[PDB]
Chains A and B, each alone.
Chain A
C-alpha cells in the first residue's frame, strides 16, 4: 500500500530513544505513545509500552514482528460476551 519512495515511517522521537536505549545495556521498557511507528530492524530486542487508550501494554519485539506498525500488536477495545436481552 504505502508508497515506495516514501519508505517506512517512524516519528524519529521513537528512533532517537531506541538508538540511545540500544547502546545502554540495562534496557527497561520504553514508554512510547507512537502506535504509528513501523517496527525498524534496530528495534529488535527492545520492549515498548504502547498506549492502548487507557494503559501502556508491554510488547516484546522480536526478529519476526518486524515490518508492521507498533500499535498493531496491541488492542484498543474489548468484547468477550453478550447478554441475553429477554
Chain B
C-alpha cells in the first residue's frame, strides 16, 4: 500500500527544517518560498559531479545565508576560485541585488551513508547503460562497508528498457520504518533514460537518536572535519 513520506513523518520531532525563516506578510511569504526552491534545485540539477548532499537556506528581513554541504567541493571551488564567482552571480540574480548573501560551502563527512548522493550515483549508473543488478549491488556493498545499518533501495520504472514496468528492491538489515526514534534519511531521484524515466528511492538507517531534541546537532558530517569557507 501507500506509505507516508519517511522524511515528512519525522519533521518537527527529530528532524529540523531545511529552511528556517519568518516572513513579514502573506505576500512576502510566497516570494521567499519559491525563490529558495530555485536555489536548491539549481545546486542539485546542475553542478552534480560534486555530490551535493543537502543545501540549507537561512534568511532574515534582508540577509540571505546559504549552507551547502558537498562530498567533493573542488568542483564548486574551481581553478583558483573561478566557478565560485559564477555561482555567486547565479544566486544574486535569483534573490536580488538589494539583499546580502553569505553563501557557505561546508565539506561533509561520511559521504556514503547519505541517501541523496547514493540516489544520484544510482541514477547516473542507470543513465550510463550500466546493468541494474550489478549497479545496486556495488552501491549496496560499499555503503554497508562504510559502517551503517540496513539500506533499502527501490528502483521502479521501465526497467532495462522493457515495455512492461517492474520494480526491484533490496533490503539488507533492520530498516524500522514505523519507528520514530530511528534516523532514516530518504531521497528520491529521477534517472532520465532514453526509454523513459526511472524512479530510485533510497532508505538508509543511520542508528538510533537516543538524545531527545529537534536535532540542532549535525548528522553524518561530524566524523571527519567539516569546514572550508567562502563566507564573511
A and B touch in the complex (CB under 8 A): no
Q: Which residues of chain B have a CB within 8 Å of any CB of chain A?
A: none
Q: Which residues of chain A have a CB within 8 Å of any CB of chain B?
A: none
